[model samples]
Target chain A: LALSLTADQMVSALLDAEPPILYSEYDPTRPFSEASMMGLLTNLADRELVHMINWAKRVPGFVDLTLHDQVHLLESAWLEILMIGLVWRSMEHPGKLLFAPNLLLDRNQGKSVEGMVEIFDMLLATSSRFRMMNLQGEEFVCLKSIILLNSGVYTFLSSTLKSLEEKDHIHRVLDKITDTLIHLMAKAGLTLQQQHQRLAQLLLILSHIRHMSNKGMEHLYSMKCKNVVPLSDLLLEMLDAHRLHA
Target chain B: LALSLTADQMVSALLDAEPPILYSEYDPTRPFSEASMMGLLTNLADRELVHMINWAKRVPGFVDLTLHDQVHLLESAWLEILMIGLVWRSMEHPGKLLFAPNLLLDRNQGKSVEGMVEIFDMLLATSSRFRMMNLQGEEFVCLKSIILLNSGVYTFLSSTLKSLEEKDHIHRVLDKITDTLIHLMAKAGLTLQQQHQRLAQLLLILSHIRHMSNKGMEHLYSMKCKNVVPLSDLLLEMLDAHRLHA
Candidate 1:
C-alpha cells in the first residue's frame, strides 16, 4: 500500500497524519517548570500511545492479533516509538533539542532535568549522527516502522505463536514498506553504496534508541519515586504492566 | 541441524568452534603497551574475520554472495559479533570484564583503556542486565546468530537482491534456531511469558551492541590518527577501505 506514493510523499503523509503534540511545541504560559515538564512528558507519552495504536491499525494484519496481543505490542513498543519521534524532531532542528518548539533546549538546559544528563547526552549523540548522515524523512519513517515492529515484551509467547499466519502477513507488509523506502532513496539520487550505508546507519541507530529508552524509563521511575511528577496512567501501565523495570 | 543437541551442548559447540583470541587471554610478556594493544585488536579482528567466514560457510546459501559482498558483511558485523562474545564472557565472569581468559579488567582497569571507559560502562550495564535476567548459553547462542544475520552493509544491493532466492532458506535456518532456543527454555521450566520476556530482552541487547560497536569504531579511528599503535594491515584496510571514518 505504501508503494502507491513516492517516498517523500509517503513520509509527508505520515508526518501530517500525526498530531503536532509529538513535536511538543512551546507554550509560553506553562513555561519549563519541573512540574510542567513532567506534565509535558505525560502529555507526550499519552499522545504517543494513541498515535502508535493508530499507526498499528494501519499495518495490514496487525489488528488480526488478539486484543491481548495488540496491547502487548503497544505497551512493549510505545517508548521506542516515542523516541523515534523525538529523534526525528531533533534532526529537524540541529544543535538545539526542541523539547517543545517554544521550549528549545541547549545542552545545559537539557542536562538540567534531574537524572537525565547522561540520557540527554546520548540523545544528542544520536541526533548528531543522524544529522551527519543527512537522514531523510522517508528513511526515518521506514526506520520508525522497523523499530516498532521489533519492539514488544512477548515475541516468543503463545500469542505470537497463535498469530503466526497473520504474523507472516505483517512481515510482508514491513518488507513492502522497506522496499518502498529503498525505492524512494534511489529516486533521491543515492548510489547503491550510499543506500547501503544509509540503511545500515539507520538500523544502527536502533541500538542507541533502545539504550536511551532504558535510561528514560529509569528517569521516569526515579521521578515516580520522588513524587516529582505524576506520570500518566498510560505511561505507568506500559512501564509496570510490561515489567519494563523488571 | 542444531536440534540434534541439547541447548547447552549447542552453545558450547558454537563457542568451541571459534579460536580463543577473541577472549584475549592476558600474556605477561606481551603486556598492555599501546603497541601490543593494537596488535591484540588486530589479532582479534583477524581471528574474528576467519571465524565469521567459516560461520558463513555453514549458513545455507551464504556462499552465494560475491567475494566482495562476503567481505562487506564481515566488515560491517565483526564489532557487533565481538561484543556478543564479550557480553557472554562477562556474564560468565560476573563483575569483571574479561579481555582474555587470563586477563581480567575490574571497572578501574577497564576504565584505564584509552578511550574505552564509556564503552566499558555500556558493556557492564549490558552484563548486569543479563545477569538480572539470568541469561542462558542457548539464548546467547541464538541471539548471536540473530545479531550476525542482521548485520551487513547493504540490505538492498544487487548481491543481497540476487541472493534473495536463498534468503528464505537462511531465514528458515534462523527461525529453526530460535525455535530450538525457545523449546530449550521450555524444558528448563521457563513459562511462555518468561521465554517471551527473555527473547525480547536478548533482542533488545542488539541495540546496545550496535551503539557500542559505533563507539568502538570511533575509538579505533582516534587511535589510528594518533599512531599510538601500529594497526594491522587487514584491520587498516577494513577501516579505510570501508570508509569507516567517512
Candidate 2:
C-alpha cells in the first residue's frame, strides 16, 4: 500500500498513548541501581535500534507519520533522551557529529555528528534526574541538537542547543523539543498512540532533531493548540460523534 | 599695569568709529556708496593695524602679536559661514588641522592668511551691521558666543576667549583657563564693569552646562535670575533703605 494517510492521521497514530521511549527506565517511580539502570539503558539502546530498523521497513514509504507516533518516538526517559545526534552525524556537518568539549562554543566553533551523539549522552545523564518524583523546579543539564527533519524553519529541536549554557540550555532544549512534538501531534488530530514498535522507532528517529532553546516554545505550543481545538472539534462533530455512542 | 581691558577692547578701539561718512551729492540720508564704504572700511583696517602694533609694543610677549592683537578681528559677515565646516573636517580625521588654510601658521589650502583675513572681514562686517541700527534680522546672520571669559570662572577676561566648539571638545582646557582667570578677576575686581562682566559671563557660561532640554532656555535664564536676585536684594535693598541716612 502506498503510504497514504492524511498528515493528521499519520501524526496522531505515532504520538498518542504509551508515548515514544525518551529514556531507558520503564517504571520511573521505581528507582533502579546504577548498574541495573545502565544495563537497561544499554538494552533499550539495542531495542531502540531494532525498533528503528523495523519501523523503517513497515513504514518504508512512511515518509509521514501521525502526530501521536512522532512524539511517542521522540520522548526520552531517564538519561536516554530523544536526540538528533545520529541523524545529524550521518547527514551533515562535522559540528553536528561532535559536542564542543567546553561549556560554551566560541563564536568560531563548529559542530560535528560525533559531538551530537556525545550531547545525547550528556542529556541522558541530565534527564535521568528529572525522573525522580522529588525533583522539583525543572533541573536539566546543558542540551544540544541538530535536526535531520523538521516541521518549520527548524529541522532539529536542538540544532542550536549546544550554544546554550548549563541548566538554562538544558531546560530550554527539552521544552522546545517537547513543545514541537506535542504541537505536531495535536495538528495530526491525534488523541491516542498506536503501533508500539513503530512509535518507539519513530521516537528514536525524531528525537535527534535538536536546536535547544526556551525561546518560542510557548509559541509552538500555542500553534499546536490552535490546530488541535479546531481539528478535534471537526473530527468529533463530523466523523466520530456516533463513536461516542459505541 | 595689569591688563586693564580685554584684548577685544584693544581690537575694538583700533576699529574706531568715524563721523558717519555719507556718500552721493548732498542728500542728508542717502548713506554711503560701496566705494565710500570701502574707504571707511580701509580706514578702520589701518587704525586696527596701528592699535595692534601699539598693543604688541606694550605687551611683553608680542611674538604672536598679530594673533593676540586682533581678538575681535574676525567677523561673521565677510564670509558665508560654514561655521561648523572646519570643526567637522577636523573631527572627520583627527590628524588634520582645522583653521589650517586660514589661521594656521602654514597655509596649505594656500589661502591661509587670506582665508583668516577673509573670516576676520566677515566678523568685522557682522560687527558693523550689529552696530548699524539699519541692519535687520535675516539681513545679517548673528551667531552667539557664551562669553566665558567674562564668567566668574575667570576674575579677568584675559586670553580665554576660546570658541565654544574648541572648549566643548576639551572642557578641561576651558575649565582650567577659566579658573585661573576667575581668581585673577576676583582679586582685581575693582570696577563694576569687571564685576558685571564676570557675573554676566558666569550666567552665560552656566547656561551651557547641560540640564534637561525640556525645561527650555527659560530654565537656565531663571537660574541666572535666581543667583543675581539674592545679591541684588542684599546690596540694592540695603543701599535703598539706609544709604540716605548713612
Candidate 3:
C-alpha cells in the first residue's frame, strides 16, 4: 500500500494526533502537590514520546535503521521534539504557557519554582518571537522533524556503527528533513527570502529549547536531590539521556 | 595578497581586536541613573557593531555586496553574533557573565535587572553546556560565522535583486565556514560521531543566541515603553531591527 499524502496532508495528520492542551480546560481548584507535578511531567513526556515514535515511523528510511539506532534517535531528540511542540502550542495563546490541559501557568506562577523562572522567561520570549514571526503550522511540523532528525545524542551510538558511515548517514537524514522543510515552506506560499528567514528563526527557537532542557534537567536534579519531588530512575535516565560529550 | 594564518591564530587576532569590558571598572557611585545606563548601553552597542562589521568584512566575498546589504545583514545578525561571543567568553570563567570588560554580572546581579534574570539563567545553562562539551576556540570562531550568516532579516530585502543575492551569498560563505568547522573537529581527534555531536552542539548554541537577542530586544522595549531607560532613536531602531514580517 502506498502512503500518498502530500507533505501538508501528512503534517496535518500528525498534528491532529497531538491535540492542543488548553489552559481553560484545567480545574483550578485541584490541589497542587509535588507528586502531582511529577506525575504531570511524566505523563506529558510519555505522551510526547509516543507521538514522536509514531511520527518517526512515518518518515521514509527512518525504520530502516537498526532497532537500537531507532530508540537512540528517539530518546536523544525527545526533549527537542517536545519543546518544539510545546512552543508551537503555546504560540496559540499569547502571554500564557500551557503545560497541560490541567496545568496552565501565567508568568507569575512560573517564577515560584526554584529555577523555573528563568526557563519560563526564555519560554515566554520564544513564544513571543514565534508569534511575531507568524510561524505557520506546516513550518512548525517541518521544524519539529528537523530537530528530531538532527539529534546530537546520536554521537553516543558511534560505537555501534562503522566509523565514518554513521556520521554520513545522520547528516544525510538531516539533509533530507531540511529539504522537506524547504519544500513545505515553498508549498505554503513563502517566497525564497521568507523560506530562509523562517528556517533561521526555527533554528533560533531550537537553540533556546536546548538551553531550556538543560535547565529543566538541572531543576529535576535539584528536586530529586532535595527530595522535593519523587523522580523515578527511568525519568532520571531520560533527563540525562543526551550525553553529547565533547 | 593571500591571507595566511592558522584558524586559531586568525581567531585570536580577531578576538583580541575586541577586548572584554570589566564591570568593576565602573564608578560604584555613578548614581545608577537611567541616563548613565543609557549611555553605557549606547557605548556597548556601538563597540559591538564595529566588531560585527569588522568581523563580517573578513569573511570571504562579504565586501562584494552592496553597502546597503552589508549594513542590513549587520543590523539583522549583530545580536546573534554578540550573544555567541558573550557565551563563548563567559565559558572561560564559570558562573560569571562578562558583558564587556567593565560590565561583568554575577548570578545575584543578574537577578536585579527587571528582565535580565531569565536571560542570565539561559546564558548560564549555555555556558555550562559549552564547558561540558569542551568547545574549542577554532570551533567557536566558525560557529560565530555560522550564526552571523543565517540572518532572518534577509526577508525584508526581498524587493531588491542584488539585495537578495546578499542573503544567499552569505549562506554560501557560511557553508564554507561550516566545512572548515567540521575539518577542524576532525583534526581535533574527534570520532565521526563526536564530530556530528560537536557540530550539532555549536548550532544549538547559535540557536540560543537568537533567543537571547529576542529577549534582549523585548527587555529594551519594556525599558523604552516604561521610560525605565532613555533610549536614543538610533538604539531604538537597532532593537526593532529584524522586522522580517511575512
Candidate 4:
C-alpha cells in the first residue's frame, strides 16, 4: 500500500490514520533506553535518507535544526540520535527515572566512564563547530543577535539547567546547549521556537502559580476533610470558584 | 523477565526501554502509534494498581487527585491519548497533515459527514459543559478551575479552532482555553488569573511576535537569486537587522 503511491498521496495516506497511531513505545510515560532506540535506528539506516529528512523536516517551525543539518546530523548521529528522545524523557521526569544509555549496555551497570566521557566530548566538538558556523553565518546575513540567540531549545535547556542541583559540570554542558538553542531559534523564527520556551516557562512557572490557584482547591479539601461540607457541594463550589477566576 | 519483578520493577522495565518499544507493528522511522501503545498499556494494566498507588503515596510533594485518580488518568489516557508526538508532528506541518477524528473522510467531499458531524456535535457539547464548569470552578478554588480547564484538553480544540479560522468563534474558544492556561500559570505565581486580561495580552503578543519573526527569516531568501549562498549566511544578516531595529 505504501509503495503504490505518489509523494503527495503518500503524504495523505500517512495523515489519514485516526486516533492517529501514537506508537506508544517512545511514549512520554516510558523512557526508551539508547540500546533499543539504536536497534530501531539500525533498521532505519538502510532506508532512504529522504525518509529521515522528512522526519526531521516535520519538526515545527521554531525547532532549531534545518533540513540540510537534519539530514547530515541524522547520518552522523543516527547511532545515538534515539538517545536524544530518551534523554529528553529522563529530563522530563528526572525525579522518577534515571533512563540512562547504560540500560542498553551489554551489562546494565552502564558502559565505562571513559566511554561516556568520549561521547560527551564528541557532542561538545560537533556543537561547537555548529555554533561557530552559525555565528559566522549570522555575520553576513544581517541576522539579529537576539533572533540568532537560541529561543526554543535554549529556553527549555536553560530552565532544565536551573532545575538540576547535581553535577556542577552539567552547567557547562547546559551553557553549550543554551548557545545551540538560541542559535537555532534565531534562524527558525518564533513560530517553531515558541512552544519550546512556552512549555519550559510553564513548567518553571508552575511552582509559583500553584499557590494562587491552590487556595480554592485547598478550601474544598479542608471542607471535605472536616466533613462539614458535602462532597458534591464542595466539588460544585470548587467549580464555581474555578469559573470566576479562570 | 517482567513478571519476575514487582509492579514497580515491571513499570520500570517498560520505562527503561529506549526509543520506546512498540508491541504491535513497528514503524522504523516514525515513533509508535495509538494501537501499538495499547500493547504496553495493557501489559502494565495487568499489574497491581494498589501496589503502584501505595508506592506513589509514599512520595512527598505529589500533585492533586488521589493515588487512585492519578493512576486512573494515566491508565485511561495511555491507550487512548493520540500520541503527543503525532500532535507535534501535525502542528509542525499544518497544511500537510491533519487531526480530525476521521481524516480519511474528506469533509469537502462529504464522505464522512454523518460521523464527522456527530463527533463535532459531541465536541461542542462537551466543550460547552467544560466551559460552564470551568467558569463555576473559578469562583471557589482557582486551582480547581485550572485543573478542570486544562484537564479538558484545550490545546487540541484550540488547534482545531485555529485551523477552522472561525474568526468570531476563535475568541470564544480562546476565552475558554486561555482561562484554563492562565489559571494553571497563576498557580506558580505567573498569575494568569490576577492579570486575567493579561492572558489575552500575552497570547496576542506571542502571535504578533511570531508574525514579525517569520517575516524576518523569510526576508533573507530574497538574497539567493543567483548564488546559492548557504542559508546560514543569509539567516545571520536577518538576525543582526532584527537586533538593530529593536
The DockQ for candidate 2, computed on C-alphas, is 0.01
Off by over 4 Å in 3: A1-246, B1-25, B28-42, B225-246
lDDT of each: 0.59, 0.27, 0.59, 0.29
Q: Write the per-residue lDDT of candidate 1 for residues A88-111, one digit (tens) a residue.
A: 788767666666565566667665
Q: Evaluated with TM-score, which candidate comes out highest?
A: 3
The 10-residue segment of model 4 chain A with minimum total lDDT is A141-150
Single out the weakest 10-residue window by summed lDDT for candidate 3 chain A.
Answer: A152-161
Task: Show the lowest summed lDDT stretch of 10 residues, model 2 chain A.
Answer: A137-146
The residue-by-residue lDDT of candidate 2 on B1-246, one tens digit each, is: 112434333323323421122222223355424234223333443334333333323322212223322232121101112222222223323223233332221223223323233333322222322233232221111111111121111111233456332222222322222333333445554352342233222222122121111112222233344234443233233222334546
Clash totals in order: 6, 81, 9, 62
Candidate 2 per-residue lDDT over residues A1-246, each given as its tens digit:
223444344334333311233344455455333234224534555455444433332321222433322332233121122233322222223222222111122112222222333333333322321222122111111111112111111111322334222223322333343333334444445442211111122332222222121111212233344234443343233321234555
Model 1 CA deviation exceeding 4 Å by range? A1-16, A22-36, A59-61, A159-161, A223-246, B1-18, B21-205, B208-246
How well is each residue in B124-230 modelled by candidate 4, as lDDT tens digits? 22222233333222222222212222221212222244323332232232233333444444554643223332332232223122222222223323344446464
Q: Sorted on DockQ, highest at the top, how do the candidates line up?
A: 3, 1, 4, 2
What does candidate 4's lDDT look like per residue over A1-246, in tens digits? 222333334333323311111122334555444335433432333232233334433322212433222233333222232332232223333222223432322222323332343333322322222233332322211111111211111111112443232112222222332233334444556442242333222322222122212222222233334444553343233222233545
Candidate 4 lDDT at A11 equals: 31
User: Which one wins on DockQ?
Assistant: 3
Query: TM per model?
Result: 0.49, 0.17, 0.50, 0.17
Task: Flag the better candidate by TM-score, 1 or 3.
Answer: 3
Worst 10 residues of 1 chain A by lDDT: A151-160
Model 2 lDDT, residue A145, Cα: 19
Q: Is candidate 1 or candidate 4 better by DockQ?
A: 1
